[PDB]
Amino acid sequence: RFLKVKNWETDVVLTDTLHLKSTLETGCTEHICMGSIMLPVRTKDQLFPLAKEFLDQYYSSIKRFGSKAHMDRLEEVNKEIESTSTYQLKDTELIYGAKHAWRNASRCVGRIQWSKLQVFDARDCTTAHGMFNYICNHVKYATNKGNLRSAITIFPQRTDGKHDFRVWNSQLIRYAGYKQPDGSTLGDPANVQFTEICIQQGWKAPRGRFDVLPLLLQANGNDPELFQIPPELVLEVPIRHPKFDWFKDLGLKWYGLPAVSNMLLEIGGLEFSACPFSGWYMGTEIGVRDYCDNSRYNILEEVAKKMDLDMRKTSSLWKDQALVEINIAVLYSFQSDKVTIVDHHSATESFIKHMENEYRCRGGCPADWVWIVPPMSGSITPVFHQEMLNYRLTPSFEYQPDPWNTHVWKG
Amino acid sequence: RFLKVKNWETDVVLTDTLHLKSTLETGCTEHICMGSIMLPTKDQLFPLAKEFLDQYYSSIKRFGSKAHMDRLEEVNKEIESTSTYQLKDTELIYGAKHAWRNASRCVGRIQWSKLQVFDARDCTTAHGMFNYICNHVKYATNKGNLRSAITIFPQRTDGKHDFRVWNSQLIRYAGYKQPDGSTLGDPANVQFTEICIQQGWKAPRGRFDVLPLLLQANGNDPELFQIPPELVLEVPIRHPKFDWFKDLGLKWYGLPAVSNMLLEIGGLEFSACPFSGWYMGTEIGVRDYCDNSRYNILEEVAKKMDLDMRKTSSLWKDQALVEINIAVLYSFQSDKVTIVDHHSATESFIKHMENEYRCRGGCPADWVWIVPPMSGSITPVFHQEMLNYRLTPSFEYQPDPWNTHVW
Ligand code: HEM
Ligand code: HEM
Ligand SMILES: Nc1cccc(C[C@@H]2CNC[C@@H]2Oc2cccc(Oc3ccccc3)c2)n1
Ligand SMILES: Nc1cccc(C[C@@H]2CNC[C@@H]2Oc2cccc(Oc3ccccc3)c2)n1
Ligand SMILES: C[C@H](O)[C@H](O)[C@H]1CNc2nc(N)[nH]c(=O)c2N1
Ligand SMILES: C[C@H](O)[C@H](O)[C@H]1CNc2nc(N)[nH]c(=O)c2N1
Numbered sequence: 001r002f003l004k005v006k007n008w009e010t011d012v013v014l015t016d017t018l019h020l021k022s023t024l025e026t027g028c029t030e031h032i033c034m035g036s037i038m039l040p041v042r043t044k045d046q047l048f049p050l051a052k053e054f055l056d057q058y059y060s061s062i063k064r065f066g067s068k069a070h071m072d073r074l075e076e077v078n079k080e081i082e083s084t085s086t087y088q089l090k091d092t093e094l095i096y097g098a099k100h101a102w103r104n105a106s107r108c109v110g111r112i113q114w115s116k117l118q119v120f121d122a123r124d125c126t127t128a129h130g131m132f133n134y135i136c137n138h139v140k141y142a143t144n145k146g147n148l149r150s151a152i153t154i155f156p157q158r159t160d161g162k163h164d165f166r167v168w169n170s171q172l173i174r175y176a177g178y179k180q181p182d183g184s185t186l187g188d189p190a191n192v193q194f195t196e197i198c199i200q201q202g203w204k205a206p207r208g209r210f211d212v213l214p215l216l217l218q219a220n221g222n223d224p225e226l227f228q229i230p231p232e233l234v235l236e237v238p239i240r241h242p243k244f245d246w247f248k249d250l251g252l253k254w255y256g257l258p259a260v261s262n263m264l265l266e267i268g269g270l271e272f273s274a275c276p277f278s279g280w281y282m283g284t285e286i287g288v289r290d291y292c293d294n295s296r297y298n299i300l301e302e303v304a305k306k307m308d309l310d311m312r313k314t315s316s317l318w319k320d321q322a323l324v325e326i327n328i329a330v331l332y333s334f335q336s337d338k339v340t341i342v343d344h345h346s347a348t349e350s351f352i353k354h355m356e357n358e359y360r361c362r363g364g365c366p367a368d369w370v371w372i373v374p375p376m377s378g379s380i381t382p383v384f385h386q387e388m389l390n391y392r393l394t395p396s397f398e399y400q401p402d403p404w405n406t407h408v409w410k411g
Numbered sequence: 412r413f414l415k416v417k418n419w420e421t422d423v424v425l426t427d428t429l430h431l432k433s434t435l436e437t438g439c440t441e442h443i444c445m446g447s448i449m450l451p452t453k454d455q456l457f458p459l460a461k462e463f464l465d466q467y468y469s470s471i472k473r474f475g476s477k478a479h480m481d482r483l484e485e486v487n488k489e490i491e492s493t494s495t496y497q498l499k500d501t502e503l504i505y506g507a508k509h510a511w512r513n514a515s516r517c518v519g520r521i522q523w524s525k526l527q528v529f530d531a532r533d534c535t536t537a538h539g540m541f542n543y544i545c546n547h548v549k550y551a552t553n554k555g556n557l558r559s560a561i562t563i564f565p566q567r568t569d570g571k572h573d574f575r576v577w578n579s580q581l582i583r584y585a586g587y588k589q590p591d592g593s594t595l596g597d598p599a600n601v602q603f604t605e606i607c608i609q610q611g612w613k614a615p616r617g618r619f620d621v622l623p624l625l626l627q628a629n630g631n632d633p634e635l636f637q638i639p640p641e642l643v644l645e646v647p648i649r650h651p652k653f654d655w656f657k658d659l660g661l662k663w664y665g666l667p668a669v670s671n672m673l674l675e676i677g678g679l680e681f682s683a684c685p686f687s688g689w690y691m692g693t694e695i696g697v698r699d700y701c702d703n704s705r706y707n708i709l710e711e712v713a714k715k716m717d718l719d720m721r722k723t724s725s726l727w728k729d730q731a732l733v734e735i736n737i738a739v740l741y742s743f744q745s746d747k748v749t750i751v752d753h754h755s756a757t758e759s760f761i762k763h764m765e766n767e768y769r770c771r772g773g774c775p776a777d778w779v780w781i782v783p784p785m786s787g788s789i790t791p792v793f794h795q796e797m798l799n800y801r802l803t804p805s806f807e808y809q810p811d812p813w814n815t816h817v818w
């Protein structure tokens with residue numbers, strides 16, 4: 001079968017065949033579209049087919065499909081599964097797998113970069129202190145004094161599900177949030193529950209507006225342990241505006257390294273429950289979402305007050321005006337400090353070129369429009385006008401339950 | 412079978428059961444989501460008629476009554492006899508209001524029950540259609556105090572006697588390709604404008620030429636009519652801060668009036684059913700003015716603002732976008748022509764969704780269309796999960812008539 005997508009701005013039409021290789025389910029049916037829903041131990045039996053499919057994909061990619069080396073590797077994995085119930089990936093297969101999980105990530109606008117991913121193999125790690133060391137090295141490598149480099153660190157795979165490696169933090173670097181008795185929040189409201197966990201575990205909270213959270217790390221299914229990332233490894237950018245001199249006095253800053261730590265990486269049926277990865281920011285992630293969401297820092301009012309905009313009616317577009325100024329400030333600040341960032345125009349234009357190339361070379365590019373379209377100025381970016389097909393390919397990054405809801409406390 | 416939707420800003424969860432009624436298909440499957448694609452006998456008619464009357468009689472608390480069974484008998488008799496049937500005025504009005512209620516791409520549905528329905532089923536000629544349409548235009552415009560309205564022309568019969576309005580909207584501006592290589596006026600309407608010329612229209616060849624109506628009655632060749640200018644309320648565009656804005660020579664019309672869709676009620680098909688409401692400001696200021704394939708004015712505006720257009724990261728496009736949209740709202744409000752901003756409209760839609768969940772068990776909504784084309788995440792609809800499904804009565808797309816009509 002062939003499926004067409006159309007760009008309504010350019011009339012360019014593309015043909016997708018890659019969707020035929022998708023097996024996992026979307027949430028949608030013939031009767032209902034779930035495209036805007038945020039969240040819509042394996043047997044030996046189910047494991048060898050997943051391994052075989054992955055290895056066939058790997059061997060095809062290196063132009064060795066059906067070779068002696070391909071056949072011998074299938075036999076070796078087969079033997080290992082029946083004998084031990086699982087298998088180990090070769091370093092080459094792990095690198096290919098992690099790159100392809102990023103390539104397949106339909107909610108990621110940054111995928112033009114997918115083939116440049118530094119993979120750190122941490123499968124020999126055994127303790128939380130060992131995880132802390134791997135993570136510091138990742139942060140220092142990825143930060144590169146502001147010249148950011150994409151990286152992922154991969155801890156040992158799930159065995160029986162009772163010995164999981166997990167980073168409890170949702171991102172490696174994030175700010176604390178504190179609920180006050182009067183109901184107001186100090187710091188980042190998204191991180192209140194996690195901050196409470198840290199405090200309970202013994203973190204002495206400074207109780208400010210931008211306190212970098214400690215890492216909470218779980219090795220081998222044991223209770224997690226706290227660690228403070230060395231401050232010299234945490235690059236931060238003070239936010240100021242090119243024309244508005246009062247902007248600095250809002251006291252805003254943000255960290256340079258966006259690093260997702262709560263997802264699960266599936267490669268050939270194996271499950272890597274701790275696989276922190278990082279790239280660099282697109283400006284709207286900070287200036288639109290982190291700063292201006294009602295349930296996040298929520299700074300729109302204070303900024304619009306300072307700009308002296310007419311705030312009595314929504315129809316003066318004061319919120320829209322303040323939004324653009326904050327986003328200009330974020331890009332200006334990062335660029336001035338020589339910390340890698342991309343604006344939403346550049347990033348979406350690059351994504352369209354990536355997508356077109358993927359269709360030609362791969363037969364498709366699964367993409368989730370709801371997530372790819374930026375959260376401001378949607379239709380003046382080329383992605384708004386681009387039809388997309390969303391489907392699930394493996395290797396993949398998946399969501400997993402927060403570890404505090406599932407962990408068995410050993411005490 | 413029961414489905415939950417969460418708002419990620421407020422944590423409110425609603426439960427959807429209304430989707431189980433849904434009959435038509437979405438284009439998605441278990442393996443692929445088509446959420447962002449723009450367009451994804453006698454025997455057939457009685458289940459469709461039945462399903463409709465059942466919901467009609469339920470809505471007036473008379474389900475299973477003698478009037479209910481009687482009407483079901485009467486329509487059954489008429490289909491068996493004539494191969495079609497005729498709606499009672501009450502059913503037509505109900506069907507039309509519900510087609511709006513079921514429109515998953517429409518953010519303005521809080522207004523669904525306040526719709527003036529003009530029954531034009533007695534219409535026979537294109538001059539007659541012109542009369543009905545002028546009357547609709549005048550009524551809906553109401554000298555700037557806009558009222559929602561639909562005019563319904565006779566239903567499909569054998570499909571060779573189709574009523575159609577060839578225009579995509581009742582009021583739109585012409586588009587012309589020039590020797591220059593550029594486009595004068597609205598590039599979306601270039602083809603339709605050509606069809607107007609080839610059928611006889613004398614084009615002024617300006618930037619904002621109100622198009623003529625091309626009306627097809629009873630499957631005949633369509634005919635041209637100029638809408639009386641004094642019935643077309645237009646708004647000159649100016650800015651409350653920038654005195655130079657007015658010299659861009661921009662204007663828009665006050666009445667948004669979709670005329671190319673098909674209304675389906677109880678299996679009956681109404682191929683000419685122009686309807687109108689009032690504008691949300693972004694439709695004009697973001698899409699009409701700033702789409703690259705539309706009036707595409709961002710460059711000119713940014714230049715007059717003297718922004719740094721050297722790099723994308725100065726956000727010069729975004730700054731100009733906001734100002735253009737401020738001018739749209741200010742101009743309509745100053746001239747007392749009804750308009751809604753995207754903040755107000757999306758706030759209302761969330762309230763409407765809550766009413767629908769509470770009173771009907773759900774609300775079909777297409778997130779891709781509901782979230783405004785600028786400032787998405789500062790509107791509450793961005794953070795609201797929505798389930799998309801197709802309920803009838805409905806508005807449906809249909810082929811452009813020039814590709815289909817046999818002259
Ligand atoms: C190189 C620069 C990159 C940029 C500019 C970028 C951009 C983005 C953005 C803007 C999002 C949406 C974030 C949100 O709204 O929460 C995202 C999501 C995502 N990206 Fe990237 N990305 C980059 C690198 C990476 C890397 C290195 C990986 C993994 C190897 C990755 C995998 C993902 C995944 C799995 C998501 C979905 C997250 C979720 O569902 O919460 N990206 N990307
Ligand atoms: C009263 C004020 C109204 C407002 C503010 C409003 C708002 C909107 C907006 C912004 C759109 C998206 C338009 C686009 O991007 O092309 C839309 C679509 C739509 N609306 Fe409304 N609407 C209103 C009245 C109506 C009425 C009276 C009807 C029918 C009786 C209706 C039915 C529809 C339909 C069927 C669509 C989808 C059109 C398509 O798929 O092209 N709306 N509405
Ligand atoms: N520029 C880049 C580079 C790499 C990765 C990203 C992803 C960016 C970088 N910070 C966070 C963001 O993803 C999130 C944000 C918030 C929650 C989250 O997890 C979820 C999401 C939905 C439901 C439940 C949990 C993921 N952005
Ligand atoms: N504020 C209101 C009130 C009622 C209706 C509307 C819908 C508003 C009123 N003008 C325009 C808009 O409909 C369009 C315009 C152009 C294309 C379109 O969708 C397509 C796209 C491609 C092919 C076919 C249809 C829909 N907006
Ligand atoms: C309900 C809705 O799906 C949700 O708010 C989504 C919309 N699109 C998004 N897109 C991105 N990139 N990130 C997000 O957090 C969201 N949130
Ligand atoms: C391809 C994509 O579906 C298309 O550009 C859509 C996106 N969302 C939209 N939303 C509205 N309200 N109107 C539109 O025309 C569109 N266009």
Ligand SMILES: [Zn+2]
Nearest residue numbers: 028033439444
């Ligand atoms: Zn879908």
